[PDB]
Amino acid sequence: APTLTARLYSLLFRRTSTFALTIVVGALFFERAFDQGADAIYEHINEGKLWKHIKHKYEN
Amino acid sequence: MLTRFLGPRYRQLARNWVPTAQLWGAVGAVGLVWATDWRLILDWVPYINGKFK
Amino acid sequence: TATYAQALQSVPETQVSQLDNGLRVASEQSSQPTCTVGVWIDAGSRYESEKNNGAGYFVEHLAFKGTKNRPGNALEKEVESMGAHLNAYSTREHTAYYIKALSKDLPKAVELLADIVQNCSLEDSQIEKERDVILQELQENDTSMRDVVFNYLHATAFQGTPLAQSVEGPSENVRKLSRADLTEYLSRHYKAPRMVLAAAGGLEHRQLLDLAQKHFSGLSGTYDEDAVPTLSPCRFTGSQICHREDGLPLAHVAIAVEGPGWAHPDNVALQVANAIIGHYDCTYGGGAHLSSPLASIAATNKLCQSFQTFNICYADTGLLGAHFVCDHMSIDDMMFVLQGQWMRLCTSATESEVLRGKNLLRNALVSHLDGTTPVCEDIGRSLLTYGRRIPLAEWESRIAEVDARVVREVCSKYFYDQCPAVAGFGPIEQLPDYNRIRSGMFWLRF
Numbered sequence: 092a093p094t095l096t097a098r099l100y101s102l103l104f105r106r107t108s109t110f111a112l113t114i115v116v117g118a119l120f121f122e123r124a125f126d127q128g129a130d131a132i133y134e135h136i137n138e139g140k141l142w143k144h145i146k147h148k149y150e151n
Numbered sequence: 152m153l154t155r156f157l158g159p160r161y162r163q164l165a166r167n168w169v170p171t172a173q174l175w176g177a178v179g180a181v182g183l184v185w186a187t188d189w190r191l192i193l194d195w196v197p198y199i200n201g202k203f204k
Numbered sequence: 205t206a207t208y209a210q211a212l213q214s215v216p217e218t219q220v221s222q223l224d225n226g227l228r229v230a231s232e233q234s235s236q237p238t239c240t241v242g243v244w245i246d247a248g249s250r251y252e253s254e255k256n257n258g259a260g261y262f263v264e265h266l267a268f269k270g271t272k273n274r275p276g277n278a279l280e281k282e283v284e285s286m287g288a289h290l291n292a293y294s295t296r297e298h299t300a301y302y303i304k305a306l307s308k309d310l311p312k313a314v315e316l317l318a319d320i321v322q323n324c325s326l327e328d329s330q331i332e333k334e335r336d337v338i339l340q341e342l343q344e345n346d347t348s349m350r351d352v353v354f355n356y357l358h359a360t361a362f363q364g365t366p367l368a369q370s371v372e373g374p375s376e377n378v379r380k381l382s383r384a385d386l387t388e389y390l391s392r393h394y395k396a397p398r399m400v401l402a403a404a405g406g407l408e409h410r411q412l413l414d415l416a417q418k419h420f421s422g423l424s425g426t427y428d429e430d431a432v433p434t435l436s437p438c439r440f441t442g443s444q445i446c447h448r449e450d451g452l453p454l455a456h457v458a459i460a461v462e463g464p465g466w467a468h469p470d471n472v473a474l475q476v477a478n479a480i481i482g483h484y485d486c487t488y489g490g491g492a493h494l495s496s497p498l499a500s501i502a503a504t505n506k507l508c509q510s511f512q513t514f515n516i517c518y519a520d521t522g523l524l525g526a527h528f529v530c531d532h533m534s535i536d537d538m539m540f541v542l543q544g545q546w547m548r549l550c551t552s553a554t555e556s557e558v559l560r561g562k563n564l565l566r567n568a569l570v571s572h573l574d575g576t577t578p579v580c581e582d583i584g585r586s587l588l589t590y591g592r593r594i595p596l597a598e599w600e601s602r603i604a605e606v607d608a609r610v611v612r613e614v615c616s617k618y619f620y621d622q623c624p625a626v627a628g629f630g631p632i633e634q635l636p637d638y639n640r641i642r643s644g645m646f647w648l649r650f
Contacts, residue, residue: 108174
């Protein structure tokens with residue numbers, strides 16, 4: 092039983108190759124998860140959007 | 152005349168740096184892809200399907 | 205044509221024995237008319253506390269100044285008169301007393317060692333006379349930049365541990381250490397099972413065993429109940445000690461990472477790597493053409509006056525690095541290059557350089573064990589550390605196993621992205637900041 096940060100260090104941080112690979116792969120997900128999670132926060136507090144407003148007009 | 156770099160030691164040098172050069176391409180590919188939002192390439196990653204269809 | 209390989213098998217086996225004492229008696233017979241004998245004890249500043257630090261060093265002074273059976277200068281005259289030589293030394297983990305002598309003088313040589321090791325008089329007037337001699341050696345030592353810099357290196361690398369301390373101790377211990385402190389340190393440590401009676405030359409194992417039984421039986425006729433002779437591991441610390449002194453004409457600098465310790469097989473590959481890097485001195489013939497890139501660049505660009513790599517080993521820990529001497533405006537370049545070489549070996553070592561490093565170790569190994577004294581010291585201390593002798597041939601197989609991969613991996617392990625211990629003395633304004641040194645321990649392209 093080593094620790095987490097240790098595992099992370101051994102497998103990914105030691106080399107600048109992996110270190111860099113890990114962060115670019117980290118940004119790809121962070122951006123996607125931050126945008127989503129953050130939009131939903133923006134929406135939940137508002138709700139006088141163009142969204143809910145739409146619902147009213149699938150017609151023409 | 153580039154034959155100065157042709158020999159056993161240079162071949163061992165080339166080898167020791169292959170993984171590094173490989174992993175640098177990994178970083179460059181993923182990085183180019185993610186900065187331009189490569190529609191083509193990305194559509195295949197499970198999550199990151201923030202383009203519905 | 206006996207091949208090198210063949211000659212390694214020709215080296216006679218080291219014979220080992222044990223008295224009921226626990227005293228190990230070891231020899232390597234060779235048919236010389238001369239020999240070396242002495243006793244190796246594992247006692248040294250690392251076993252000492254803050255309070256008695258410098259104790260063993262104090263005993264080493266007293267050691268040859270009178271026993272019970274031969275008080276005052278009687279020792280000297282017995283040795284001097286046979287033409288023998290009587291020496292002693294103490295490191296942080298080891299102490300030794302040995303005699304170089306005509307082979308047919310083995311009997312008395314041995315008789316003498318026992319007497320020294322057991323019946324040391326420690327006459328109150330002598331210890332007082334020695335108080336001032338040691339103090340004086342201290343002033344003496346303060347002028348050897350190199351000695352001072354490794355003492356600093358140990359002091360910062362092992363900062364809160366016993367290995368941080370020096371062998372001679374601080375001046376105040378020399379001032380206050382009393383006879384009782386010595387006798388207690390002796391009783392505590394000069395005990396059979398931690399002593400090895402070693403010899404090399406024109407002797408025969410049985411004679412040495414007989415003598416060991418004759419003059420040494422009766423040391424652990426006691427043996428302690430709960431005493432506490434155990435060695436605790438020593439914390440290594442990534443740190444820096446800078447003793448700035450612009451009045452000194454050249455800078456001394458010693459960097460090291462944490463070594464593994466006497467027992468670890470990794471030591472063979474580390475030394476091979478260290479040989480590749482080498483050492484250098486401004487009196488070396490041919491500089492620009494030297495194999496070692498550090499060495500050759502240092503010679504062409506005058507970055508250095510000297511430098512050497514090193515692998516100090518202690519139990520379970522050690523200092524692995526290099527020390528160098530240079531002008532005030534070259535410390536930065538010397539570090540840049542020294543560090544480039546470790547990195548290069550970590551990630552990029554080639555095959556022919558490893559072969560050169562390997563051969564360099566073979567020649568060094570063999571060149572060293574030449575003559576009774578060095579072989580004796582090797583028998584004596586090997587038994588302390590490895591427990592056995594480790595014959596030339598075994599070392600040869602270890603060395604043979606090392607190739608580029610082994611160098612890369614073994615170097616990476618101890619060097620790569622590791623916090624070093626830095627010691628510096630002198631005109632060191634240009635010595636790089638620690639963060640900067642620390643960043644030199646990894647490569648951003650890797």
